[PDB]
Design a protein around this nucleic acid. Structure first.
Ligand SMILES: [Mg+2]
Ligand SMILES: [Mg+2]
Ligand SMILES: [Mg+2]
Ligand SMILES: [Mg+2]
Ligand SMILES: [Mg+2]
Ligand SMILES: [Mg+2]
Ligand SMILES: [Mg+2]
Ligand SMILES: [Mg+2]
Ligand SMILES: [Mg+2]
Ligand SMILES: [Mg+2]
Ligand SMILES: [Mg+2]
Ligand SMILES: [Mg+2]
Ligand SMILES: [Mg+2]
Ligand SMILES: [Mg+2]
Ligand SMILES: [Mg+2]
Ligand SMILES: [Mg+2]
Ligand SMILES: [Mg+2]
Ligand SMILES: [Mg+2]
Ligand SMILES: [Mg+2]
Ligand SMILES: [Mg+2]
Ligand SMILES: [Zn+2]
Ligand SMILES: [Zn+2]
Lengths: 118, 38, 51, 40, 43, 162, 59, 38, 222
RNA sequence: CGAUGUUGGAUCAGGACACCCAAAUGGUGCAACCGCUAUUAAAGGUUCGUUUGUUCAACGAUUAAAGUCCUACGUGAUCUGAG
RNA sequence: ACCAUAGUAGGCCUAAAAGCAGCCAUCAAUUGAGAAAGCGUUAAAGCUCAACAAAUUCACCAACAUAAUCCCAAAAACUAAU
């Protein structure tokens, strides 16, 4: 019988070289996930379909911002084979209320606050 | 529908064949052949 | 030096000009084009435009 | 094509993504006054 | 001359269709993407 | 090089050995530390059937191969060079390394068909009348499998069966 | 229709009515390898001798 | 000649030779030992 | 002129009484009246029992799964008895007598109607399980020579191995699996559920690690 | 199952070789003839009668041979109806 | 490739068991040869292996036919391919 797959905790134990390979900070974990649905939910289990629905990834190739908490990390682990996950980068910091209409999201994973100045 | 264990080698699914091909063993190949090496 | 079929790559070697000479040549070419534009010796112009 | 090169350089995988070919106004009045903004 | 008994992709004797280098590269790319995902889902 | 000379003079046979001058190796090899000749001249994964100047260095004047215990090559390169020499001989290279037969050169036969990268012998392969379907196809081998380790500047693998 | 426009000749014996129509000659897709006797002596001498045969051996 | 899938020498005077693309066990003392690999 | 080498001497080996193989019964003394379902788990997967030498120094190692019945038992027994040395060699079984019943139906019977009739009995053997273990004051060349025929005649593929040969092959397998170059491995992918491959794979694949497929075992697949 | 007409024969045969002859060979417990096996080769042939509806089957006379099959165990908008 | 001599027919049963239907011992001569690892005789005889003396490439297993209307895209081992 085909059922849900238990994922052992050993898989999510990062190696020292993984941080250098993927450009991650070994000390401070990132704050927000940018998730993009790559594959389709057809020919996939209904629980995976429901997870992708509750994660707000109905439209493929559209990034979505989520927290870095274990509550959503559990679902991200469940459907990790259908999404690409990147850390949100803020070179210019969090946009204020005066820059909400001038923000943009570059494909490299960073959020620019001042976009197209004049 | 065939049984789990058969005699005809039980030709696998295409995804399983791709997985086997990807996970095939790759021996370590040294840069210089040591036979004719000093 | 031994010369075999696979000893050398099967494509002619490419040599690029020096960066300073390339910059000087580009300056000369752009100056000539600007002079052509100023003199107005162009008859008809076509344009690829995104719209 | 050429999506990987654009991704490495930081541009969108598709040239229509947040590039100047789409963000800028594609037309304007001959007098110079701004054109109405685009729905997209 | 060479017949495939039964249906082409159902019976005990199926088509011997092999795996291609393009498929291998695609699977490797997907595996790398998922490995990066599970790295980011660690901390 | 040693040559055997036979002299017949009045029911008397004289068999003698004569030593001639032989060329020597070039003074400067790129990798003097290599034990093997090819492996020290850095021709490994470089030669092919097209390179006749290297294949002609150690072969008998009648097209025969030379012993490895006398040549000095590693086993893999010896086998590869034997295959390359066979391929060149079948393709028609080394025209001067055939035995001289005054009687046999007058009765000409059908013109020699041009060929290259021939793996098997021309007189031992039966034509494939079935040729196989798409899934099961009897592919035609071209080239020797021992040459699959050669450098590929384009990077594409060499099709050994087509 | 496009096959009727194709002309194939076993040898270099082409009628003049066809020869007068030729515009350009396409390069050969395969480089013809040289034979041993076709190599020049200067190139033969330039190519190094990889191995030194012993004097005692007989060929 | 006997056509077989596996060739083995039945005496010390049998020699194995590759001819016409096949393998042949040839014996001169005992002609009955002639074997041809199929 | 050639250099002499010391010949291995076997002084700590004692030949027990009745070194030849014991006769086995096609049907056990107590037949199984209740018909049993043909479980395939007794063949699928690696062998857990009879995986190590007990008293002998050579063995017949099975690289695949199968069923051994009275014909195979008689063949092995007769061959070993007629090709063994009773004074310097002894043999021992590692598989029990045929006990699992096999049901058969006569020709011309349509599908269904109930279970068939017990025809014969077989013994299930998994891959990696020894069949016959031999010992004595002999070398490895002759025992391998006269056991290769038995291994070939066995249904599943088999080899005539020794303690040294088994250790060598296990060490080579471990070395290959630890120096494998590609970072992607079947065990890692199956455990991590990469690409959602658990849909195509089987729950037993998590333990088989891609080395076992049905009754067939490939030692070269890491 | 708003029809795929069902055995044998008459006529016409197509094809495969896992060959009966005809052809080229090897080994033989092949001295010669009759023989026994093994390889390749399918352009051509593979009989006439009695009994049985018979396919098979048994018998008579021969032949170099009376080969095994597929073809809706070929062929009823060509035929025969004995079962 | 290179050659093969000595106690000796080692001792028992058997018409014969001389390395060889079988059982027990398995010593000892020449630097160098097993009461003999394969052929062979009714029994022998005789022919090979390993032992010295002559050199010393590598040398463990792995190869397997077929059906019927007519085979079945053609083709291509290197110009730079995540
Ligand atoms: Mg099922
Ligand atoms: Mg079908
Ligand atoms: Mg089918
Ligand atoms: Mg077997
Ligand atoms: Mg009907
Ligand atoms: Mg109808
Ligand atoms: Mg109708
Ligand atoms: Mg016909
Ligand atoms: Mg035939
Ligand atoms: Mg005949
Ligand atoms: Mg015919
Ligand atoms: Mg039928
Ligand atoms: Mg009919
Ligand atoms: Mg009819
Ligand atoms: Mg009618
Ligand atoms: Mg009809
Ligand atoms: Mg009637
Ligand atoms: Mg002595
Ligand atoms: Mg000797
Ligand atoms: Mg045959
Ligand atoms: Zn070498
Ligand atoms: Zn012989």
């Amino acid at each position: 019988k085909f059922t849900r797959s238990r994922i052992p905790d050993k898989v999510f134990q990062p190696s020292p070289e993984d941080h250098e390979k993927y450009g991650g900070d070994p000390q401070y974990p990132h704050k927000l996930h940018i998730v993009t649905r790559i594959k389709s939910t057809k020919r996939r289990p209904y629980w995976e379909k429901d997870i992708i629905k509750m994660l707000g990834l109905e439209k493929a190739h559209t990034p979505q911002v989520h927290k870095n908490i274990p509550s959503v990390n559990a679902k991200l682990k469940v459907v990790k084979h259908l999404i690409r996950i990147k850390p949100l980068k803020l070179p210019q910091g969090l946009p204020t209320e005066e820059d909400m209409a001038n923000t943009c999201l570059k494909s490299n994973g960073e959020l620019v606050v001042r976009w197209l100045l004049n | 529908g065939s049984k789990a264990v058969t005699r005809h080698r039980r030709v696998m699914h295409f995804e399983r064949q791709k997985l086997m091909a990807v996970t095939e063993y790759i021996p370590p190949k040294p840069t210089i052949n040591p036979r004719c090496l000093p | 030096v031994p010369k075999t079929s696979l000893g050398s790559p099967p494509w002619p070697d490419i040599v690029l000009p020096d960066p300073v000479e390339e910059t000087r040549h580009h300056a000369e070419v752009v100056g000539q084009v600007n002079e052509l534009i100023a003199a107005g010796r162009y008859g008809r112009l076509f344009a690829v435009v995104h719209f | 094509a050429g999506s990987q090169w654009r991704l490495q350089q930081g541009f969108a995988a598709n040239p229509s993504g947040y590039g100047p070919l789409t963000e800028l106004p594609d037309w304007s009045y001959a007098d110079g006054r701004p054109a109405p903004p685009m729905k997209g | 001359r060479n017949r495939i008994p039964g249906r082409q992709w159902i019976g005990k004797h199926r088509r011997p269709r092999p795996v291609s280098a393009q498929a291998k590269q695609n699977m490797i790319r997907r595996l790398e993407t998922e490995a990066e995902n599970q790295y980011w889902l660690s901390r | 090089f040693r040559e055997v000379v036979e002299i017949l003079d009045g029911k008397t046979t004289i068999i003698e050995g004569r030593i001639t001058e032989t060329p020597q190796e070039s003074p400067n090899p790129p990798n003097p530390t290599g034990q093997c000749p090819i492996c020290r001249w850095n021709l490994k994964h470089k030669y092919n059937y097209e390179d006749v100047l290297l294949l002609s260095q150690f072969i008998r004047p009648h097209g025969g191969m030379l012993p490895r215990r006398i040549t000095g090559l590693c086993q893999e390169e010896h086998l590869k060079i034997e295959e390359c020499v066979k391929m060149a001989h079948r393709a028609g290279l080394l025209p001067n390394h055939r035995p001289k037969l005054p009687e046999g050169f007058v009765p000409k036969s059908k013109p020699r068909l041009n060929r290259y990268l021939t793996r098997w012998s021309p007189r031992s392969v039966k034509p494939i009348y079935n040729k196989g379907h798409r899934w099961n196809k009897v592919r035609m081998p071209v080239g020797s499998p021992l040459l699959k380790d050669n450098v590929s500047y384009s990077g594409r693998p060499l099709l050994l069966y087509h | 229709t496009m096959m009727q426009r194709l002309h194939l000749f076993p040898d270099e014996d082409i009628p003049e009515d066809i020869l007068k129509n030729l515009v350009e000659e396409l390069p050969q897709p395969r480089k013809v390898p040289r034979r041993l006797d076709e190599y020049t002596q200067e190139e033969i001498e330039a190519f190094p001798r990889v191995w030194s045969p012993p004097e005692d051996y007989r060929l | 000649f006997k056509t077989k899938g596996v060739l083995k020498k039945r005496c010390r005077d049998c020699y194995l030779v590759k001819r016409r693309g096949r393998w042949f066990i040839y014996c001169k003392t005992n002609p009955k030992h002639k074997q041809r690999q199929m | 002129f050639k250099t002499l080498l010391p010949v291995p001497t076997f002084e700590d080996v004692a030949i027990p009484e009745k070194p030849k193989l014991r006769f086995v019964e096609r049907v056990p003394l107590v037949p199984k009246v209740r018909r049993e379902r043909k479980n395939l788990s007794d063949i699928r997967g690696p062998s857990t029992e009879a995986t190590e030498f007990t008293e002998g120094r050579f063995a017949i190692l099975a690289l695949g799964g199968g069923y051994l019945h009275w014909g195979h038992f008689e063949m092995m027994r007769l061959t070993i008895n007629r090709s063994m040395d009773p004074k310097n060699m002894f043999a021992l079984w590692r598989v029990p007598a045929p006990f699992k019943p096999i049901t058969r139906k006569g020709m011309g019977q349509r599908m269904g109607g109930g279970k068939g009739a017990i025809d014969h009995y077989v013994t299930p053997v998994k891959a990696g399980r020894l069949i016959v273990e031999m010992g004595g004051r002999c070398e490895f060349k002759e025992v391998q020579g006269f056991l290769d025929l038995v291994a070939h005649k066995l249904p599943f593929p088999a080899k005539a191995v020794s303690r040294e040969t088994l250790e060598k092959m296990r060490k080579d397998q471990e070395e290959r699996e630890r120096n494998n170059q590609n970072p992607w491995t079947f065990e890692r992918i199956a455990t991590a559920n990469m690409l959602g491959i658990r849909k195509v794979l089987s729950p037993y694949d998590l333990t088989h690690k891609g080395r076992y497929w049905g009754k067939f075992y490939t030692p070269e697949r890491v």
